[PDB]
Design a protein around this ligand. Structure first.
Ligand SMILES: [K+]
Ligand SMILES: [K+]
Ligand SMILES: [K+]
Ligand SMILES: [K+]
Ligand SMILES: [Mg+2]
Ligand SMILES: [Mg+2]
Ligand SMILES: [Mg+2]
Ligand SMILES: [Mg+2]
Ligand SMILES: [Mg+2]
Ligand SMILES: [Mg+2]
Ligand SMILES: [Mg+2]
Ligand SMILES: [Mg+2]
Ligand SMILES: [Mg+2]
Ligand SMILES: [Mg+2]
Ligand SMILES: [Mg+2]
Ligand SMILES: [Mg+2]
Ligand SMILES: [Mg+2]
Ligand SMILES: [Mg+2]
Ligand SMILES: [Mg+2]
Ligand SMILES: [Mg+2]
Ligand SMILES: [Mg+2]
Ligand SMILES: [Mg+2]
Ligand SMILES: [Mg+2]
Ligand SMILES: [Mg+2]
Lengths: 86, 211, 108
RNA sequence: AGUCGUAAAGUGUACUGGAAAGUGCACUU
RNA sequence: AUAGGUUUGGUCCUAGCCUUUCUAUUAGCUCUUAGUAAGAUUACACAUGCAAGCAUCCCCGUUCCAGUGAGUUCACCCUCUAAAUCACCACGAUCAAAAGGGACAAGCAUCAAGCACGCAGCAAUGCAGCUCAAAACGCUUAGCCUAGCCACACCCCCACGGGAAACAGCAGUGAUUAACCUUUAGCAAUAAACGAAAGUUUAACUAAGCUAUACUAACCCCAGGGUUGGUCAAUUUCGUGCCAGCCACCGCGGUCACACGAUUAACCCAAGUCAAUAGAAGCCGGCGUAAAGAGUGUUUUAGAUCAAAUAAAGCUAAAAAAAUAGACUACGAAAGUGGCUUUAACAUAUCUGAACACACAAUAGCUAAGACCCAAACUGGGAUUAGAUACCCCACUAUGCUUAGCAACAGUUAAAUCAACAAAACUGCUCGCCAGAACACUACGAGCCACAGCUUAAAACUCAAA
């Protein structure tokens, strides 16, 4: 398996706690939507295997933070809410 | 019910680990004589044992210095000698030492018990083999040591009932028409007072688990 | 309904009771966002003292401040209870006087 | 709101570009 | 419920909302003493100290007690039968696992199909079966059936392994919530563990600490809280003037306010009072006009007692559709059927029971083709007052045509019949339907469209009405 190569990322001004500022996409595996806090500029480093590429895009689902629950214990995780069907 | 397979896996592997990590007598019943602690577990022995632990010998500490590990020989205990005037001893019939021991001073033994001058019919396993309590009877002393004349062991054969039980029994008899004046009695010849220091069945006893 | 129909349908099933503005709680703590005044519905005329508050549940709500004269400002902490202000439509919450920053009405 | 002014016939539906309503079709008294 | 208030110009009915009663939590203000009972909001994170030893070594115990309510028909009964206690030689009793049989919460059908869920045979294999609208399968909610029981013991259902470094044991702390008890003492009693035993250990427990949360009993002196328009017990004087303000519902406030502020007095309860919240508290009542019952027939697991039609061929008289009879009221399940002849032909020996089965029938609106005498919305043309006739005349479309497609049933008139109005009231029996306005409103969106328009909704929310 290739090693994970790093790539530095800077995010734009945080547009509140309900609207994503970026989706970091790990090729076809999936993506992570980041919501900074207001005015906050964040510094990130994304690691992906050497052969493949990491792509930061404007969010596909920007209001995806809102569908969640409450923090469980001291864990960073939030309880998962199943989305409405289609 | 979603079958719980990890529980079965854990039970099986734990059982396997136990059966392949059975500690030996040399490890279980070793002792540190300066601190009087078991190195295997770190637990201290009770205070009342301390002196004997520093003075007396374990059974195989004696048997490992004898031909055939001392089959046929007589072994007594210090506590028996201090407690009882009548002879108490084991006549050894089988010995299985712990071969891993450096001095071959741990293991199991079987014998015929004579307690307070009364011999048993069969041979059974000896308890407290790992205790620092044992003494070997010299061969030139055995005849003097075993000499015992059975004294008349005539004890009470019946006792009175407790007052209320006696009154209730008499009342029941009188109600059923009986007019007997014979005192109700409780039979105790069948209840034999077995001394608290009589050897127990080493076969039924448990063993310390490895850990 | 016949006996068979009542056996089929079963005992009457009362719908779950509706939660009010306090979500079934005696009181709620809130942070004042802004103070203002509202006009009653008209058999009546006045300038009722009200304030918008963010409740501990995160929801925002309009609350009525009882008594003559209040010193509530933005960012102040208040305790709000139930009870409709009958003349103000949509105002179902009332500020508790004498708790946290909201003090008692001054005498006279 | 006044401190403002003044004394055969129907019901539907469709179309309506000479529509202050008309015509067409079906119904009611 | 022994009920009460509130819709109207007024009466009656229906219906929602609220008041009066009893608890619990929290908040405001106010609180004297004694005894007892009960006692974080959070399965969020935890500094610190304790909560398991005993015992002549072996063993035994730390698998109990104590805690929590996250998850959730493992708890109950019967059968069989381990481990444990006592017989201790077992006969067997007691206690109770695993296994087999039975029973066992609530909502949602806008969750209707599940998809191998069965049987027979020693097996090989064979059959195609099993559950389900009397609710399977599925989603959501919740500890329960309380001398107590079930489940869990930081998380990954489990715990070899991993995350990671654990008070849901006691005391205590941080965060959070409207919610907020001591970092006390002793094993003297009981219980448990161990010991042959004197005994030892125990944050179980016992005895104390704190708290108006409750109960009980006081108190020589010492009372507060709320209310006073009606429901509902109880206002004097001023101040203010639709302002300030007040109310549970109805409602008050515009210069005489018993309704707001103060003051006086009264009323209720009282070491409390009572503001908010949450419970307790409710369908055997109705369906013509208030919410709720017809298109017709057959069948259907169950339940009940009540065991001049229609289709075909032919034929026609007056002027293709059928005057008289017909003042008839027959046939047909309904819609419908009334020119003549002939041929077939008009189910069923109890009743109720279909959205989902089969037949019909009618009503809209579009789609394909076809006929076109006649009539005819629209569309043209001609004539007319002094905004002609909207209205008369002519021509001709869509269309009118033809195909093929998209409360029941049986018995009663005895009773006060009898909210009214309709249509005199009734019983029994069954199915379907009904639990304020609200078959409300609304486009977050979706489809068609393709920048700007069209079609398509429930719920909240509000109110004391409708
Ligand atoms: K022991
Ligand atoms: K629970
Ligand atoms: K668990
Ligand atoms: K004790
Ligand atoms: Mg026209
Ligand atoms: Mg018309
Ligand atoms: Mg009423
Ligand atoms: Mg405790
Ligand atoms: Mg047994
Ligand atoms: Mg069982
Ligand atoms: Mg739960
Ligand atoms: Mg676990
Ligand atoms: Mg604690
Ligand atoms: Mg914890
Ligand atoms: Mg409390
Ligand atoms: Mg306490
Ligand atoms: Mg202590
Ligand atoms: Mg106490
Ligand atoms: Mg007043
Ligand atoms: Mg209080
Ligand atoms: Mg109706
Ligand atoms: Mg029928
Ligand atoms: Mg024509
Ligand atoms: Mg019916």
């Amino acid at each position: 398996f290739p090693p994970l190569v790093a790539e530095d990322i800077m995010l734009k001004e945080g547009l509140g706690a309900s609207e994503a500022v970026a989706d970091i996409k790990f090729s076809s595996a999936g993506w992570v939507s980041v919501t900074p806090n207001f005015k906050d500029r964040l510094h990130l480093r994304g690691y992906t295997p050497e052969g493949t590429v990491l792509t930061v895009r404007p969010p596909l689902l920007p209001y995806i933070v809102n569908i969640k629950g409450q923090r469980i214990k001291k864990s960073v995780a939030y309880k998962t809410k199943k989305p409405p069907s289609l | 019910v979603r079958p719980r397979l990890i529980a079965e896996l854990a039970r099986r592997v734990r059982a396997l680990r136990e059966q392949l990590n059975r500690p030996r007598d040399s490890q279980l019943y070793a002792v540190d004589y300066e601190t009087l602690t078991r190195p295997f577990s770190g637990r201290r022995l009770p205070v009342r044992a301390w002196a004997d632990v520093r003075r007396e010998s374990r059974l195989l500490q004696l048997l490992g210095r004898l031909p055939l590990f001392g089959l046929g020989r007589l072994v007594t205990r210090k506590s028996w000698l201090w407690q009882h005037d009548e002879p108490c001893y084991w006549r050894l019939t089988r010995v299985r030492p712990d071969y891993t021991a450096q001095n071959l001073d741990h293991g199991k033994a079987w014998g015929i018990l004579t307690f307070k001058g009364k011999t048993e019919s069969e041979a059974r396993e000896i308890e407290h083999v790992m205790y620092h309590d044992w003494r070997l009877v010299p061969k030139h002393e055995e005849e003097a040591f075993t000499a015992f004349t059975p004294a008349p062991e005539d004890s009470l054969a019946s006792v009175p009932y407790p007052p209320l039980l006696r009154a209730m029994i008499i009342a029941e008899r009188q109600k059923n028409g009986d007019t007997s004046t014979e005192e109700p009695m409780l039979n105790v010849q069948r209840i034999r007072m077995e001394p608290w220091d009589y050897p127990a069945k080493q076969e039924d006893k448990g063993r310390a688990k490895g850990t | 309904a016949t006996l068979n129909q009542m056996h089929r349908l079963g005992p009457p099933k009362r719908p779950p009771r509706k939660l009010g503005p306090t979500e079934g709680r005696p009181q709620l703590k809130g942070v004042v966002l802004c103070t203002f005044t509202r006009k009653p519905k008209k058999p009546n005329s006045a300038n009722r003292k009200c304030c918008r508050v963010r409740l501990s549940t995160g929801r925002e709500a309009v609350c009525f401040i009882p008594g003559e004269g209040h010193t509530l400002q933005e960012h102040q902490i208040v305790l709000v209870e139930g009870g409709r202000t009958q003349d103000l439509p949509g105002v179902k919450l009332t500020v508790v006087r004498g708790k946290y920053d909201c003090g008692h009405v001054q005498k006279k």
